[PDB]
């Protein structure tokens, strides 16, 4: 219908936070491999001079940016790991919603604001938020440990 059909990269840029919540795979994919699929595929064109005359001016432009894309990507996958949820896309926590971050209610958050819009209104607190989830894991990580000893 709408959630089971085509959309496109970054299509829900101006769609509500709730709307975008279906089209994650679209922008959760191609973060990496958006280019490694295309590069490997298009680069094996019948040229036979891939990296001829060793490396060149486009030589570093790519590798300086190839090596970025992955660590940039592995940075967000390191957060999923360190927050104990690499299920991605959507994941709940014990960290509760400090209304000091946003006093607003549920109804309008998901059905009126968009993520671009939202992440701005919440940009300043994200640092403090993100650090709360890490300390949420470690409480849980010690509580796990304590029980590993006695059983």
């Amino acid at each position, epitope marked *: 219908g709408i959630g089971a059909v085509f959309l496109g990269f970054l299509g829900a840029a101006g769609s*509500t936070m709730g709307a975008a919540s279906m089209t994650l795979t679209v922008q959760a994919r191609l973060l990496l491999s958006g280019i490694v699929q295309q590069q490997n595929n298009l680069l094996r064109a019948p040229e036979a001079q891939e990296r001829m005359l060793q490396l060149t001016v486009w030589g570093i432009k790519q590798l300086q940016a190839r090596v970025l894309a992955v660590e940039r990507y592995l940075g967000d996958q390191q957060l999923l790991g360190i927050w104990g949820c690499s299920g991605k896309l959507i994941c709940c926590t014990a960290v509760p919603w400090n209304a000091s971050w946003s006093n607003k209610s549920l*109804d*309008r958050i998901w*059905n*009126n604001m968009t993520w671009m*819009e939202w992440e701005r209104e919440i940009d300043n607190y994200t640092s403090e938020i993100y650090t709360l989830i890490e300390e949420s894991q470690n409480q849980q990580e010690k509580n796990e440990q304590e029980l590993l000893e006695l059983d």
Partner: nanobody, 131 residues
Framework: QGQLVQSGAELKKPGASVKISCKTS????????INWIRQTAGRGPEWMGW????????????????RVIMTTDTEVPVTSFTSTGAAYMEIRNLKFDDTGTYFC????????????????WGQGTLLTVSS
């Protein structure tokens, strides 16, 4: 966070035309509906109809479905998050009881149950109809 303005009191006669527009500020005109409500003293504040400035879909009141026709202009962005725009509602074959303080009203949400239901309200420019 925004504000709406309208067309001033346009005196007309029974059996004529009268046009009443609404212009926006401080919000994305396309993102929200535009409703229309008067203040007939005899009937009450009767709701006329709403229209989407994005999808062009309407839902007029069967009372004036054939009588009135709605229409909108393009949106003129101010910032990356705000804009300005125009919308209309003309009514022909007028009578006497088509009068009151006329309000335009922007919707509440972009999505949900109360999508079209108005939150922000216009000026209220009074209209009388006599020869």
């Amino acid at each position: 966070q925004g504000q709406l303005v309208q067309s001033g009191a346009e005196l007309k006669k029974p059996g004529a035309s009268v046009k009443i527009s609404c212009k926006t500020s401080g919000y994305r005109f396309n993102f929200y509906h535009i409703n229309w409500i008067r203040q007939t003293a005899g009937r009450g504040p009767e709701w006329m109809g709403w229209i989407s400035p994005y999808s062009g879909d309407k839902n007029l009141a069967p009372a004036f479905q054939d009588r009135v026709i709605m229409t909108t202009d393009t949106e003129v962005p101010v910032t990356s998050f705000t804009s300005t725009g125009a919308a209309y509602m003309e009514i022909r074959n007028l009578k006497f009881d088509d009068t009151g303080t006329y309000f335009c009203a922007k919707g509440l949400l972009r999505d949900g149950s109360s999508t079209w239901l108005p939150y922000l309200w216009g000026q209220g420019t009074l209209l009388t109809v006599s020869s």
